[PDB]
Design a protein around this ligand. Structure first.
Ligand SMILES: *C[C@@H]1C(=O)C2CCN1CC2
Ligand SMILES: *C[C@@H]1C(=O)C2CCN1CC2
Ligand SMILES: *C[C@@H]1C(=O)C2CCN1CC2
Ligand SMILES: *C[C@@H]1C(=O)C2CCN1CC2
Ligand SMILES: C[C@H]1C(=O)C2CCN1CC2
Ligand SMILES: C[C@H]1C(=O)C2CCN1CC2
Ligand SMILES: [Zn+2]
Ligand SMILES: [Zn+2]
Lengths: 190, 190
DNA sequence: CGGGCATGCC
DNA sequence: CGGGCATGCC
């Protein structure tokens, strides 16, 4: 009945974890600082191999309680101003994948983007998905300065939740500057 | 052949001049500082009475040479987020008038808004048009921090130019602050 | 690149 | 209200 997706970490029976200029990641804040329309690799780590047909879904949610029930969408300006697959209303794109699906949920109206889970090749320890955020956090008529989380869910082909992780995202012009400011504020005022 | 409207002051044979918290006007800068979607009265002054059927047209133009040939439009966000007469692409509206016309020029693509010239009633010395700017100067995908001029033209019913005046506009959140900053910068660095 | 400005907002 | 913050940009 809820149209608000869960954000609670569930690393699950497969031991699902995420792994991480243009962008910088803060472990202390569990927060990515990146620039708009520049791809950000996110690593998928598992302790046990997921079943064939496992899928990886990404969905944004507003972090603040007062905004959590509002669907995160691309702002009207960047909707108007395009890879031929992503609907222009979607904030999060996946690059570098031939089986990307974009979902507009018919009941919750939430956007998500899904790709097949590919196990690491023999010799490799993780797999990478190239995400792209098509607005700044500040975009008027879109995120409008409200922080988001990206929720990454590992799902089997039947729809079962296998694992869930999330990280906060700030899409901004100056990731290094803004990261330093936020880490300093955490230490001084958090 | 030109699609760039003239901005040169032409007070003309009728002695046409303009006359002038929510907003403040700087004579030194010939510049209105106002807030978005809040009406701004502009006074029309004439030395001689224009003929019956005279019209008053308002049109925005970018002030900077590198932007002058781009049509000034409402940004996509405020286009989407409405008095039932103004097309949502138009930046400048007129309130308080029953004969407002909105023009999208079929050749130049420029927007303008026109009302009848009404002579001041017996006892009055000027007439007022209530303009409304539907974006901030800063709006992404619209003016995008580029200053505009508003060009007010007094035209007879045949289309003859009777007079022309202009003023710069900054639509902003804090007109009083921004006016003081710009006047100070004129004195210190102009 | 990075310090400072420009500007909606707290 | 007004000083200060938040943030794309110079
Ligand atoms: C944005 C940065 C990078 O360069 C890679 C991918 C995402 N983060 C962490 C590692
Ligand atoms: C995490 C994995 C690896 O083991 C190497 C380096 C980064 N990714 C892809 C290959
Ligand atoms: C914005 C201010 C006002 O209060 C009136 C109309 C426009 N300016 C000058 C006078
Ligand atoms: C300029 C005119 C006048 O003479 C009075 C005061 C302001 N407007 C309208 C009436
Ligand atoms: C802050 C941001 C900028 O404004 C440029 C480009 C990348 N960052 C440093 C210099
Ligand atoms: C600057 C602007 C604001 O932020 C509020 C409203 C009007 N001005 C003063 C206080
Ligand atoms: Zn945007
Ligand atoms: Zn706007």
């Amino acid at each position: 009945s809820s149209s608000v997706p869960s954000q609670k970490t569930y690393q699950g029976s497969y031991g699902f974890r995420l792994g991480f200029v243009t962008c910088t990641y803060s472990p202390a804040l569990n927060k990515m600082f990146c620039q708009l329309a520049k791809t950000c690799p996110v690593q998928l780590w598992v302790d046990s191999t997921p079943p064939p047909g496992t899928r990886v879904r990404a969905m944004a949610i507003y972090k603040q309680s007062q905004h959590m029930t509002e669907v995160v969408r691309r702002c009207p300006h960047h909707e108007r101003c395009s890879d031929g697959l992503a609907p222009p209303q979607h904030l999060i794109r996946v690059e570098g994948n031939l089986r990307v699906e974009y979902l507009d949920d018919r009941n919750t109206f939430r956007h998500s983007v899904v790709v097949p889970y590919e196990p690491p090749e023999v010799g490799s320890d993780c797999t990478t998905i190239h995400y792209n955020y098509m607005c700044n956090s500040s975009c008027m008529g879109g995120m409008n300065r409200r922080p988001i989380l990206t929720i990454i869910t590992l799902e089997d082909s039947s729809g079962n939740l296998l694992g869930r992780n999330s990280f906060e995202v700030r899409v901004c012009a100056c990731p290094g500057r803004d990261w330093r400011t936020e880490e300093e504020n955490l230490r001084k005022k958090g």
